[PDB]
Design a protein around this ligand. Structure first.
Ligand code: 94M
Ligand code: MG
Length: 210
């Protein structure tokens, strides 16, 4: 049921740079993932204007932030367009190869990690704070899939059997032991107000019952 794939060499080199560089400004990961969710919501909204049945899988367009201190996870959920199996296995890595190479150029010349988003590879900044990332996703045209990687040069894809989503994407960050500040409600609110105040969809921060 689970298929294992190698990352393309450039992506693998990027993930190793991100994991093993000393860089203290790690909070930018959350800005980049919210920006990704916003773009995904823009895309389904646009598609729905000429085919309203694209929203039959769900009319709400929003972003939820869900910390869980018991599992040490931070989950970002959106109801955007989602990703197909072809996206997860090939398309995303292929479009990213070009920006990755330029980002690794931009860096040695005189750039810092915070500009990662300008090269279209902001997703990989998740590995600043995560030892593992799980992505659950459902596109209109495909089934529900789970993607997972602890970096390491490989990732897995499997059909997901968990609770159905309808449509969209769930990024689950399994946080490193020393990065648990991003589970605190005060800290998340500081980052969102600082970096994402002008996002055009409701962002709901769920509170923990613990
Ligand atoms: C499988 O994990 C990803 C990989 C390997 C590369 N980029 C993105 C960003 N990304 C691309 N499309 C995305 C959509 Cl439709 N939505 C979100 N929220 N992120 C996306 C994701 C989630
Ligand atoms: Mg809600």
């Amino acid at each position: 049921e689970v298929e294992t794939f190698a990352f393309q060499a450039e992506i693998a080199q990027l993930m190793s740079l991100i994991i093993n560089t000393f860089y203290s400004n790690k909070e930018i990961f959350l800005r980049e993932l919210i920006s990704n969710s916003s773009d995904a919501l823009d895309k389904i909204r646009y598609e729905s204007l000429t085919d309203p049945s694209k929203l039959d899988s769900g009319k709400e367009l929003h972003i939820n932030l869900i910390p869980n201190k018991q599992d040490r996870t931070l989950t970002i959920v959106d109801t955007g367009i989602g990703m197909t199996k072809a996206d997860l296995i090939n398309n995303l890595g292929t479009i990213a190869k070009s920006g990755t190479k330029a980002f690794m150029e931009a860096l040695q010349a005189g750039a810092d990690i915070s500009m990662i988003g300008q090269f279209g590879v902001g997703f990989y900044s998740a590995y600043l704070v995560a030892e593992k990332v799980t992505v659950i996703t459902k596109h209109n045209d495909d089934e529900q899939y789970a993607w997972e990687s602890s970096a390491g040069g490989s990732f897995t894809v499997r059909t997901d059997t968990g609770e159905p989503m309808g449509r969209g994407t769930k990024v689950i960050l399994h946080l490193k032991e020393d990065q648990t500040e991003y589970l605190e409600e005060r800290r998340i609110k500081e980052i969102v107000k600082k970096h994402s105040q002008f996002i055009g969809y409701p962002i709901t921060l769920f509170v923990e019952k613990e």
